[PDB]
Amino acid sequence: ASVYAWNRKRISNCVADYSVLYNSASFSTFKCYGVSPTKLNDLCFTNVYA
């Protein structure tokens, strides 16, 4: 999406592995603001919004 009209896909009803994402070294940034990226695999959530 163009940033004037950003998309917001709901992610729900799944098992995730954020280490797969974090290990994608092609990502130029992975800053986290209320959780640590190492801890994500121990957590669970009601929803994630992409």
């Binding site: 209320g34 959780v35 640590s36 190492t38 801890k39 121990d42 957590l43």
Partner: protein
């Protein structure tokens, strides 16, 4: 109502303990009131702050 002096001494301790317990819920400017949630969500270098 006659035993006010004794009941007051019990009531003061009840208010003091209930305040001391309620204060565990106060954030004190941390991101959460619950120590185990900080330790679940955050890694040492941030969690120590």
């Amino acid at each position: 109502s006659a035993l006010g002096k004794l009941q007051d001494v019990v009531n003061q301790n009840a208010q003091a303990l209930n305040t001391l317990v309620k204060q565990l819920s106060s954030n004190f400017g941390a991101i959460s009131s619950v120590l185990n949630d900080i330790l679940s969500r955050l890694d040492k270098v941030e969690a120590e702050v």
